[PDB]
Design a protein around this ligand. Structure first.
Ligand SMILES: CCCCCCCCCCCCCCCCCC(=O)OC[C@H](COP(=O)([O-])OCC(O)COP(=O)([O-])OC[C@@H](COC(=O)CCCCCCCCCCCCCCCCC)OC(=O)CCCCCCCCCCCCCCCCC)OC(=O)CCCCCCCCCCCCCCCCC
Ligand SMILES: CCCCCCCCCCCCCCCCC[C@@H](O)O[C@H](CO[C@H](O)CCCCCCCCCCCCCCC)COP(=O)(O)OCC[N+](C)(C)C
Ligand SMILES: CCCCCCCC/C=C\CCCCCCCC(=O)OC[C@H](COP(=O)(O)OCCN)OC(=O)CCCCCCC/C=C\CCCCCCCC
Ligand SMILES: CCCCCCCC/C=C\CCCCCCCC(=O)O[C@H](COC(=O)CCCCCCC/C=C/CCCCCCCC)COP(=O)(O)OCCN
Ligand SMILES: CCCCCCCCCCCC(=O)SCCNC(=O)CCNC(=O)[C@H](O)C(C)(C)COP(=O)(O)O
Lengths: 242, 61, 175, 63, 52, 124, 459, 178, 88, 128, 84, 70
């Protein structure tokens, strides 16, 4: 779930539309269809996510919402920005799924969030990794998710689109924040609710190293890649302050 | 563009083993490899008790 | 490379910029390609020299087959089977040659599109026009013969097209 | 030692084979490997010719 | 009902798009005539853009 | 946005359609009508092969940005001034586009007011 | 061409004179050697053909079929050697004799420079198959199946003969070369319409067409393993070969007359693919899959374009190999279970992992997974049909979806899940069965490396 | 699971099942422990208001409107234990469960390893074989005429006897074989 | 997993622990073989609450048909040991 | 009171919401007892055949043979030409064929007419 | 190598309702006339290291103090270096 | 590959100083990165260039005659 259905395989279709972007820009109806499909997909998936109890289901719905955002970006004639979003989303969503799997293994193969309580202190490295990943996913300035999603939002706002698609993109961003804080609150903040036999353990170099590599990625890769690649589009240099 | 091996040619249509190394490929390959490396390092511990772990890693590769 | 002729597959003079390091930091690219050269290019080149000397020790040649010209289906009798067979074989050979010609033009077009990069739409208009002409000719020759195509069917299609052209020209002249 | 042998049985030999196959077989036929024709900017010079691209039109520079 | 409402409001948004208070983007050389399609032997109508 | 509300909730003819802008001739306002200036010619701007949509009046700053990016490769933060210059030129282009939109808008408003005044004079 | 026919004829004396416990070894060895000999026919020309003599000629359409026919006999012997263990020497030699006679008839049929000789051998192939089905069959319905498999065929083939001789009275020659070089257009007349039907339905019945596919499930289910292999792999391709050979004289009447059969095939592929979804028998499901694939081949042949013919040839070869493998796997399950029902024995991947891998590969290659030659043929036919009309793509895509669905359904029902508890006679798979699966599957993945070898004369 | 089913469910069994389902779904609704404790005690008090009721028709009217109310508020995504028939790990290890008779088909080179295990297996097979004839007789003599009425098996009554039909219950593979 | 191989001693210790935390039962009067309905004077609803406590303590849910006929802690430990295949 | 659950074909009535279950009677109890007796007899027979150490084969299941035979071989002998069956067979076996024939014929006549007028723009159309 | 250390269970009298929201539950239940029978079963969820909790905002700034100190030190160092 | 940690049965699990210090270091590093980027590059969020007011433009540079000339 962390490798195929979250970060690498499921973006493939989006990649296809990126590959044929010279033909994409010369057609207007197909672009509108792509934008509408992406908007409805991201809205519906976020709305389904904000009320799930399985953590893996919530992460999968978040991935689908991000894919819908990618499709919207393709529909608004920004294929390179969609590729950048793919690159950042792979990092932070893979690390988020790895954190989910670590928590899952620690609680003896328990997936429902109703049986997961106080883990902020019970498991600190997974806590900090999940916090950083959620902050990157929702979009924190100068994080790996900012350099992509902020530009996505600016391009959507500053271009000739449909009002409904823009509204659903904004609501999808709000719902993304909503399910991120839902995950954090229901899995890390309250009193413990797991069975009494505590088997929580993280002292394994493999898991720690694998999580921390993607942590360094999810913190620095956005800045490094954005400042390294050549400019491929006209920026929105002037903007209303609000 | 690396068109190395020539497959069947069908009248005026030519099919060959051709690889494209534009910005997209050369940028997406390192990220995918990094994520996959992290995933197998994690699966080392997560699949520690699975009898068919070698088959799992072969499937991932 | 002498292995292929430059005229059939033309290439631009391939001008490239000179390195202009504006700063004193050592770029990893130059050192990386130097170590790549030392570790890869030299052994491969030495092995190639060894193989080339071995090939030079035993030299032999092969020749491209030449075919005579034979009367085509237009000079064949209605039921004469020998000349019809010869004409059909010659027509099939010409069909294969035409397919290879279209393949060459398409190769030129693909190479130009990849080479000129962002300005492919403007800098490869000549190749597009060449392919348009050759594809129009090829389609006029063999578009609708279908399976079980033959020299007789191609000649019949050409006769139909030329009758239509003659009628149109006569109508236009007397219009 | 494990990494030393691994880097030569899993990297160096594949690079050797692929480099030989690309430089001496694939590049023998035309149009098999096609470049991008790297960008030419004003103020640059070409190694093949030695000529220098003329500079630009001296726009007014202010902020 | 959800699907029908989504489709109808998408059509409505198509009817009423969103944009910025700006004019069309201006392009220097005959709206990039030569680099978009080509045909240099036709001499298109010269378009001159506004200074403001 | 406010213009969207003004157009979809007010009078459609008051404000322009962005598809057909401009509608009125350029020199309608003043007879000076200075032309736009270009620094980038055809050949070197083709050689830089930036992009089809990037071939606008801010091309020279983009070309110099690419020069800096190619030259000072390992120090990918070395040339920050040229990015600022290209952003400044893009700002100027967008501001002139906004000025053109406002110009056509109040041209249309003045035309509508003049037509209403003429109709009132004819009726009276 | 006699360098292939004469060893096949000498296979008979060798079998009869062979020791009572050495028939299988000698037959397999010499059949494999004959296949190696017949491999030489693949070296074709871009010119007319390989005209050996006045009676036999070769072509790049006939060459892959001949190679497959020669290759099938050792596999048939290896599959049949199991269930004939308790059988007397004379009758085992008779079984091998029937197989050898069928191979000889098929080999002579695929060359057949003249159409009457082609018809004679094409109908001579019927007798050994009928004997095999009605003699070495398990169920009581085999006789009925045989009757069906007979009469259907004759119901289509007897008019053809008449048409054939009629043509020789008008044209003056039934030789394929003279027929091709002296072909003349068919006037749109009632007499020409009926001659077209007489020439066409004989081959359409054996593909089979969707309307005339009733005999195939019966014949495939009640026949033994060798009979099922030969029916699915080679005997179905006789109709396609005959159609591709005979459609030269049917133009331009083919354009008008192709519509009913095109509609029937395009809808019957969907019908049979859907039928595969609800099936309680493995052999019946494989038979209906064969019907769907041959309906696609019929569509390809009726479209009558170069890409159509190339895809048709590739699809026939690939389908023959795939169906033979599927029937072999089903027979390996049946020999342990003796019920031939999908839902009875389950979870066999737990007990037989390598056989589960063979099942997975067979299902994948039946699913038309690229770059397998199955996918090459399917894609060529799909593209040719799209060029013919852009609306066919809906039916083709639906067929692909249902094909994948029923293939993975067959795989999952038998290999995945929990094993049946009361079944305890599931012994480890033998070396013979695994070797049979490997010899079935390796040629497919080797042919995908050289597709032009099976793309036919229009390549 | 192990216990044989009955011909029908009594009223007390039905009310206990409803109590179990209602408390489980209330715990699913009430994530936190203190809230669940308070509302579960409230539900227990609501249930024990009618414990002493005697009219059977009124008792049947009860638990029925209760089941309807439960269905209306049944938490459409309830908590399920991982190994339960709806859990995420319901049949995870069923692919590793191999029958015992498979060992009878092992190659002699494989049986060369683990000799003590196969010796004990031989003793087990003999014990099953000697035991089986007696078990059939016990079942034949103990089964009421006209066939069994409930799928409950009797225990062993003699000294050397074993419970009838014991082989496939004792020889379950494992809960986690690998 | 990394789960220790729990033994019947541990299972009975945890069952008795859970039963001692049950304030309706005096800990000094409970016993391994002590019956629920008679020796401890517990109602049927209290028995099903004990079943719920065991389910939430051991991480698995006992089917109702088996749960409703478990009357003493000894049978509960025996049933859990059969479920988890406990050796010693 | 609460909103009522409405059963459907793909969403059947819940077991605890059936009005028939709460209508207990001696006849219903006897029927359930007989059903459980039949199930117990079948289970006893299966276990007697299953635990036998001498058996080294599958246990034949007459229910499975009956199911397969009724599905496959018992269809035609019980078939009767009925207006329902005749109409349904005619529809599902003829209607789709004529529908697709009309669709493809209309498309091909449109394409042929466009080719004859020459307004189709078949440039670069070489492979067919 | 597994965890065979013969872990011993704590004393059952250690778990008390006192100092927990289970007290508030019990007080609210007694105002109606009810007592909870499983209160001491779940006391361990509020007794040990689980007693002290953190807010979501406090969770967000897990390492804000050290990061801020490093930022001010680095800013001072850069200010003192560039001003030269 | 780790150290031996025993289950705890209803108490807070054993914690190693290594994981705690690593988590605190990573969180502090991310916060320092955010603050450093904000200090050095603040215009990426607040913007560097003012947004013009269309109504504040005087009528001369725009080209309007007082409603009578044209
Ligand atoms: C990918 C690069 C490969 C390079 C290395 C070369 C490998 C050569 C292998 C050739 C095929 C194998 C022969 C088939 C029979 C299987 C033999 C067997 O029984 O296994 C025993 C052996 C021992 O296992 P065991 O533990 O003793 O038994 C446990 C059980 O059996 C339990 O078994 P299991 O659970 O371990 O499963 C076995 C395993 C393997 O078993 C299989 O299922 C094999 C099936 C493979 C293809 C399936 C048919 C689809 C049509 C594809 C046709 C392409 C062929 C190309 C030419 C082939 C030349 C012969 O199944 C799979 O893993 C699923 C494979 C599905 C992959 C789908 C992707 C297909 C397209 C990939 C690209 C191909 C062209 C690339 C072009 C562009 C790049 C240049 O296992 C193996 O040897 C595994 C084989 C390695 C995996 C091969 C899968 C990919 C290869 C594709 C074809 C060759 C590509 C050529 C260059 C590509 C670049
Ligand atoms: C059962 C499972 C499948 C088995 C195989 C089925 C496929 C075989 C069907 C054969 C195709 C149709 C046969 C004739 C087609 C000719 C075209 C015709 O349909 O169109 C009109 C023909 O008009 C009418 O159709 C006249 C014929 C009507 C009589 C036929 C019976 C109709 C239904 C019977 C179906 C039963 C077929 C199977 C019998 C066993 C055009 O009118 P017209 O321009 O003037 O005639 C052109 C032909 N000319 C030039 C030679 C004169
Ligand atoms: C490996 C061990 C040996 C290592 C030392 C040798 C190093 C390389 C030297 C070998 C000489 C070069 C060589 O192999 O010859 C090229 C030779 C073909 O000859 P050509 O004339 O160029 O084309 C065929 C038409 N005549 O190429 C090869 O066969 C080898 C490399 C080909 C690619 C590798 C195959 C991988 C793909 C398998 C097929 C996949 C399915 C089909 C692809 C579908 C694409 C649309
Ligand atoms: C699986 C069962 C399929 C059965 C296949 C049957 C379809 C074939 C058509 C029916 C048989 C016709 C055989 C004719 C052989 C070709 C000879 C020929 O076409 O010559 C014609 C002869 O044409 C005929 O006589 C055909 C008449 C048909 C008579 C038999 C009718 C059989 C049933 C017909 C109805 C069925 C039609 C469609 C059947 C499709 C199968 C389902 C010219 O006659 P002349 O006198 O020489 O002309 C001189 C003037 N120009
Ligand atoms: C969120 C989910 C919402 C679910 C809503 C559910 C609403 C529940 C409302 C319940 C209403 C009733 O009281 S329905 C009342 C049903 N009728 C009776 O209970 C009569 C006799 N009761 C018995 O015999 C029992 O067994 C008993 C004596 C209790 C114990 O017996 P034990 O000695 O063997 O433990």
């Amino acid at each position: 779930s962390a490798l195929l259905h979250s970060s690498t395989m499921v973006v493939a279709g989006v990649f296809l539309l990126i590959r044929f972007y010279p033909l994409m820009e010369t057609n207007k109806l197909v672009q509108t269809m792509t934008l509408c499909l992406g908007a409805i997909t991201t809205l519906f998936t976020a709305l389904c996510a904000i009320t799930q109890n399985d953590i893996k289901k919530i992460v999968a719905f978040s991935t689908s919402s991000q894919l819908g955002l990618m499709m919207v970006t393709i529909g608004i004639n920004q294929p390179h920005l969609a590729f950048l979003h793919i690159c950042m989303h792979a990092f932070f969503k893979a690390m988020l799924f790895m954190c989910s799997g670590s928590i899952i293994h620690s609680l003896n193969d328990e997936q429902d969030i109703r049986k997961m309580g106080g883990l902020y202190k019970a498991m600190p490295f997974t806590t900090t990794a999940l916090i950083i990943g959620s902050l990157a996913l929702t979009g924190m300035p100068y994080l790996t998710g900012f350099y992509s999603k902020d530009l996505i939002i600016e391009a959507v706002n500053m271009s000739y689109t449909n009002a409904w698609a823009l509204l659903m993109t904004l609501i999808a961003t709000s719902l993304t924040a909503a399910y991120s804080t839902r995950i954090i609150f229901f899995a890390f903040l309250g009193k413990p609710r797991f069975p009494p036999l505590v088997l929580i353990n993280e002292n394994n170099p493999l898991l720690i190293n694998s999580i921390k590599r993607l942590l360094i990625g999810s913190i620095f890769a956005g800045f490094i890649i954005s400042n390294n690649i050549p400019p491929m589009t006209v920026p929105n240099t002037t903007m209303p302050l609000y | 563009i690396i068109s190395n091996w020539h497959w069947m040619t069908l009248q005026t249509v030519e099919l060959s083993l051709s690889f494209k190394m534009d910005y997209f490929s050369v940028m997406f390959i390192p990220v995918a490899l990094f994520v996959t490396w992290s995933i197998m390092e994690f699966s080392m511990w997560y699949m520690h008790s699975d009898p068919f772990i070698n088959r799992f890693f072969k499937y991932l590769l | 490379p002498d292995s292929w002729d430059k005229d059939v597959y033309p290439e631009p003079p391939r001008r490239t910029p000179a390195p202009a390091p504006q700063t004193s930091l050592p770029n990893p690219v130059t050192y990386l390609t130097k170590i790549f050269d030392l570790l890869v290019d030299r052994p491969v080149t030495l092995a190639r020299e060894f193989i080339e000397q071995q090939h030079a020790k035993n030299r032999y040649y092969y020749y491209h087959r030449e075919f005579r010209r034979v009367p085509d289906i237009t000079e064949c009798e209605e039921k004469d089977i020998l000349c019809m067979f010869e004409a059909e074989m010659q027509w099939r050979r010409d069909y294969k040659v035409d397919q290879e010609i279209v393949n060459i033009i398409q190769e030129r077009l693909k190479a130009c599109q990849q080479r000129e990069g962002e300005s492919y739409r403007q800098n490869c208009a000549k190749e597009l026009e060449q392919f348009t002409q050759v594809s129009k000719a090829f389609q006029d020759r063999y578009s609708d013969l279908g399976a079980h195509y033959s020299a007789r069917k191609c000649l019949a299609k050409q006769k139909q097209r030329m009758l239509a052209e003659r009628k149109a020209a006569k109508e236009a002249a007397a219009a | 030692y494990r990494h030393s042998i691994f880097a030569v049985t899993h990297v160096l030999i594949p690079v050797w084979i692929i480099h030989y196959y690309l430089k001496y077989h694939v590049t023998a036929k035309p149009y098999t490997v096609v470049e991008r024709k790297p960008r030419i900017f004003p103020g640059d010079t070409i190694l093949e010719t030695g000529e220098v691209i003329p500079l630009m039109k001296e726009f007014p520079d202010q902020h | 009902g959800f699907v029908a409402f989504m489709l109808f409001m998408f059509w409505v948004g198509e009817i009423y798009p969103s944009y910025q208070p700006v004019g069309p983007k201006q392009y220097p050389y005959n709206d990039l005539y030569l680099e978009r399609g080509g045909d240099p032997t036709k001499e298109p109508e010269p378009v001159v853009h506004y200074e403001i | 946005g406010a213009h969207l509300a003004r157009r979809y909730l007010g009078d459609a003819s008051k404000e322009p359609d962005p598809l057909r802008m401009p509608t009125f001739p350029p020199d309608y306002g003043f007879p000076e009508r200075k032309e736009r200036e270009m620094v980038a010619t055809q050949q070197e701007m083709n050689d830089a092969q930036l992009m089809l949509q990037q071939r606008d009046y801010c091309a020279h700053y983009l070309i110099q940005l690419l020069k800096c990016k190619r030259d000072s490769f390992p120090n990918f933060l070395a040339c920050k001034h040229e990015q600022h210059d290209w952003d400044y030129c893009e700002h100027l282009d967008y501001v002139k586009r906004m000025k053109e939109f406002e110009r056509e808008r109040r041209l249309l408003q003045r035309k509508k007011r003049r037509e209403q005044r003429e109709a009132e004079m004819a009726r009276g | 061409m006699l360098k292939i026919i004469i060893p096949t004829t000498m296979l008979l004396p060798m079998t009869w004179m062979s020791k009572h416990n050495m028939i299988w070894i000698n037959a397999t060895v010499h059949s494999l050697l004959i296949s190696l000999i017949s491999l030489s026919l693949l070296n074709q020309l871009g010119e007319n053909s390989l005209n050996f003599s006045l009676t036999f000629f070769s072509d790049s359409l006939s060459a892959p079929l001949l190679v497959l026919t020669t290759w099938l006999l050792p596999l048939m012997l290896m599959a049949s050697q199991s269930h004939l263990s308790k059988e007397t020497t004379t009758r085992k030699k008779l079984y091998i004799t029937m197989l050898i006679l069928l191979q000889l008839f098929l080999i002579m049929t695929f060359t057949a420079t003249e159409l009457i000789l082609f018809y004679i051998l094409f109908e001579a192939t019927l007798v050994p198959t009928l004997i095999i089905i009605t003699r070495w069959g398990n169920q009581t319905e085999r006789l009925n199946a045989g009757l069906y498999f007979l009469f259907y065929t004759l119901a289509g083939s007897l008019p053809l003969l008449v048409a054939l001789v009629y043509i020789q009275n008008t044209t003056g020659s039934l030789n394929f070369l003279i027929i091709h070089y002296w072909s003349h257009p068919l006037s749109n007349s009632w007499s020409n319409i009926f001659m077209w039907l007489a020439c066409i339905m004989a081959f359409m019945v054996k593909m089979p067409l969707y309307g005339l596919h009733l005999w195939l499930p019966k014949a495939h289910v009640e026949a033994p393993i060798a009979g099922s292999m030969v029916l699915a792999a080679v005997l179905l391709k006789l109709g396609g070969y005959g159609m591709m050979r005979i459609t030269t004289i049917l133009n331009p009447l083919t354009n008008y007359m192709a519509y009913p059969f095109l509609m029937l095939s395009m809808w019957g592929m969907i019908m049979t693919s859907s039928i595969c979804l609800r099936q309680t028998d493995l052999k019946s499901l494989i038979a209906y899959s064969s019907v769907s694939h041959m309906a696609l081949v019929i569509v390809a042949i009726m479209i009558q374009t170069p890409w159509s013919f190339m895809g048709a040839t590739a699809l026939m070869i690939a389908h023959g190999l795939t169906s033979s493998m599927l029937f072999c796997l089903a027979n390996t399950n049946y020999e342990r279970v003796h019920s031939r029902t999908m839902i009875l024995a389950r979870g066999l991947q737990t007990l037989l992992p390598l056989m589960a891998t063979w099942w997975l590969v067979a299902s994948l290659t039946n699913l038309a997974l690229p770059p397998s030659i199955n996918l090459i043929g399917e894609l060529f036919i799909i593209t040719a049909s799209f060029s013919w009309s852009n609306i066919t793509i809906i039916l083709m895509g639906m067929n692909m979806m249902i094909t994948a669905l029923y293939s993975l359904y067959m795989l999952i029902t038998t290999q995945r899940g929990k094993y049946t508890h009361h079944i305890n006679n599931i012994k480890p798979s033998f070396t013979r069965e695994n070797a049979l699966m490997a010899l079935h599957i390796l040629p497919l993945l080797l042919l995908t490396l050289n597709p032009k070898m099976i793309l036919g004369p229009l390549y | 699971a192990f216990s044989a089913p009955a011909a029908y469910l009594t009223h007390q069994q039905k009310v206990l099942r409803l109590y179990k389902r209602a408390l489980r779904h209330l715990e699913s609704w009430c994530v936190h422990r203190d809230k669940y404790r308070y509302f579960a005690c409230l539900m227990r008090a609501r249930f024990d208001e009618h414990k002493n009721e005697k009219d059977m028709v009124k008792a049947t009217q009860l638990l029925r409107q209760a089941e309807e109310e439960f269905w209306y508020g049944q938490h459409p995504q309830p908590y399920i234990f991982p190994e339960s028939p709806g859990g995420t790990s319901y049949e995870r290890y069923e692919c590793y469960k191999v029958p015992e008779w498979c060992l009878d088909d092992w190659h002699p080179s494989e049986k060369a390893m683990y000799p003590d295990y196969f010796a004990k297996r031989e003793q087990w097979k003999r014990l099953r074989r000697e035991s089986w004839e007696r078990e059939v007789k016990q079942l034949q003599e103990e089964t009421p005429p006209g066939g069994p009425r409930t799928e409950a098996l009797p225990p062993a009554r003699k000294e050397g006897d074993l419970p009838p039909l014991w082989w496939h219950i004792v020889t379950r593979p494992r809960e986690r074989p690998m | 997993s990394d789960a220790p191989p729990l033994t019947l001693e541990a299972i009975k210790d945890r069952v008795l622990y859970v039963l001692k935390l049950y304030d309706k039962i005096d800990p000094e009067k409970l016993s391994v073989n002590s019956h629920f309905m008679k020796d401890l004077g517990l109602d049927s609803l209290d028995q099903v609450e004990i079943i719920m406590a065991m389910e939430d303590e051991f991480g698995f849910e006992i089917p109702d048909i088996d749960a409703e006929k478990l009357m003493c802690p000894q049978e509960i430990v025996d049933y859990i040991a059969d479920k988890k295949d406990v050796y010693e | 009171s609460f909103p009522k659950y409405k059963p459907s074909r793909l969403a059947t009535l819940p077991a605890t919401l059936d009005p028939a279950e709460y209508d207990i009677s001696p006849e219903t109890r006897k029927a359930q007892a007989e059903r459980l007796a039949i199930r117990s007899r079948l289970k006893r027979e299966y276990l007697l055949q299953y635990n036998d150490p001498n058996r080294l084969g599958v246990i034949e299941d007459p229910a499975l043979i009956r199911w397969t035979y009724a599905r496959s071989a018992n269809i035609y002998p019980n078939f009767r030409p009925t207006p329902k069956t005749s109409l349904l067979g005619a529809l599902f076996g003829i209607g789709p064929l004529f529908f697709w024939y009309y669709v493809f014929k209309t498309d091909r006549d449109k394409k042929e007419k466009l080719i004859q007028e020459g307004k189709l723009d078949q440039t670069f159309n070489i492979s067919y | 190598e597994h965890g065979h250390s013969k872990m011993e269970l704590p004393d059952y009298k250690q778990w008390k309702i006192e100092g927990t929201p289970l007290e508030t539950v019990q007080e609210k239940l007694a105002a109606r006339g009810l007592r909870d029978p499983w209160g001491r079963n779940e006391a361990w969820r509020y007794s040990g290291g689980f007693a002290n909790n953190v807010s979501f905002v406090g969770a967000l700034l897990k390492g804000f103090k050290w990061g801020f100190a490093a930022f001010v030190v680095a800013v001072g160092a850069e200010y003192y270096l560039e001003s030269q | 590959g780790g150290v031996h940690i025993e289950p705890r049965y209803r108490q807070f699990p054993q914690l190693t100083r290594s994981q705690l210090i690593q988590a605190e270091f990573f969180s502090a590093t991310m916060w320092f990165w955010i603050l450093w980027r904000f200090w050095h590059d603040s215009d990426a969020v607040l913007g560097h260039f003012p947004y013009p007011d269309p109504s504040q433009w005087t009528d001369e540079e725009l080209g309007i005659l007082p409603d009578d000339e044209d």
